[PDB]
Amino acid sequence: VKLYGFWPSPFSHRIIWALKLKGVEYEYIEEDLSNKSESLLKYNPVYKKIPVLVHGDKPIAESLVILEYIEETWPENPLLPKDPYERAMARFWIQYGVDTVAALRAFYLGSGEELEKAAKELSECLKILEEQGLGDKKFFGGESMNLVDISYGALGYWLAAVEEAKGVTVLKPSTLPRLHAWAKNLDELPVVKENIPASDKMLAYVTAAM
Structure with a gap:
C-alpha cells in the first residue's frame, strides 16, 4: 500500500487516520503540488491530485472513495455501521x-x-x-x-x-x-x-x- 499525499492537506490526513485505524502498513509519498510526479499523474490522470492510494499498483483517487475502499478491503474494526x-x-x-x-x-x-x-x-x-x-x-x-x-x-x-x-x-x-x-x-x-x-x-x- 502506497499513499500519495501533501503534508498539510486534510484530504491526505483522512486517509492516514483510516489506515492507522485499520493497522495497515503503507508507504507515504510526499507530492510537490507544483511539480507533480510522473507517478501521481499516471495514477490519477482525471484529477491529477492527492490523495491517491495505490494498492498493488491499482490506484484509488478521491478521499471519500478511498475511505470506502479501505473499509471494504479491511473490514476489521469497521468504520461504517452494520x-x-x-x-x-x-x-x-x-x-x-x-x-x-x-x-x-x-x-x-x-x-x-x-x-x-x-x-x-x-x-x-x-x-x-x-x-x-x-x-x-x-x-x-x-x-x-x-x-x-x-x-x-x-x-x-x-x-x-x-x-x-x-x-x-x-x-x-x-x-x-x-x-x-x-x-x-x-x-x-x-x-x-x-x-x-x-x-x-x-x-x-x-x-x-x-
Missing part, C-alpha cells in the same frame, strides 16, 4: 461534508464584508451538523470513530489554524458546545494527534496560502 439505514445516514452526513467544505472555503477566502458573512454561514452550516448529525453522541460513529468522524476531523486542528489566521473563531464552545466538545475530544485522540501537522506549522501554511 445497518443499511445507519450506513445511509453516515453517507448522508459525509455528503453534507461537501456543503461544509464549500462553507469552509468561503471563510478561508473571506476578508472583510464577505468574511463576516462567510463566518456566519459556516456557523449555520455547523449548527445543522451538530444538531441533526452529531446529536448527543460522543462521536458520529456513536462510541467510536466512524468514517463521518474522519471526514469532519478537519473541524478541529485545521479550522482552528484558519480561525487563528483569520482572527475569527466560528467553532466556539458557547454557540456549538456539542460540536466543539466533539472536535476537542477527537483532536486529543492519539490516532489523530500523532497524525496531523504541528499546530505551529499548520498555522504558518494557512497563513502563507492566504
Whole structure:
C-alpha cells in the first residue's frame, strides 16, 4: 500500500487516520503540488491530485472513495455501521461534508464584508451538523470513530489554524458546545494527534496560502 499525499492537506490526513485505524502498513509519498510526479499523474490522470492510494499498483483517487475502499478491503474494526439505514445516514452526513467544505472555503477566502458573512454561514452550516448529525453522541460513529468522524476531523486542528489566521473563531464552545466538545475530544485522540501537522506549522501554511 502506497499513499500519495501533501503534508498539510486534510484530504491526505483522512486517509492516514483510516489506515492507522485499520493497522495497515503503507508507504507515504510526499507530492510537490507544483511539480507533480510522473507517478501521481499516471495514477490519477482525471484529477491529477492527492490523495491517491495505490494498492498493488491499482490506484484509488478521491478521499471519500478511498475511505470506502479501505473499509471494504479491511473490514476489521469497521468504520461504517452494520445497518443499511445507519450506513445511509453516515453517507448522508459525509455528503453534507461537501456543503461544509464549500462553507469552509468561503471563510478561508473571506476578508472583510464577505468574511463576516462567510463566518456566519459556516456557523449555520455547523449548527445543522451538530444538531441533526452529531446529536448527543460522543462521536458520529456513536462510541467510536466512524468514517463521518474522519471526514469532519478537519473541524478541529485545521479550522482552528484558519480561525487563528483569520482572527475569527466560528467553532466556539458557547454557540456549538456539542460540536466543539466533539472536535476537542477527537483532536486529543492519539490516532489523530500523532497524525496531523504541528499546530505551529499548520498555522504558518494557512497563513502563507492566504
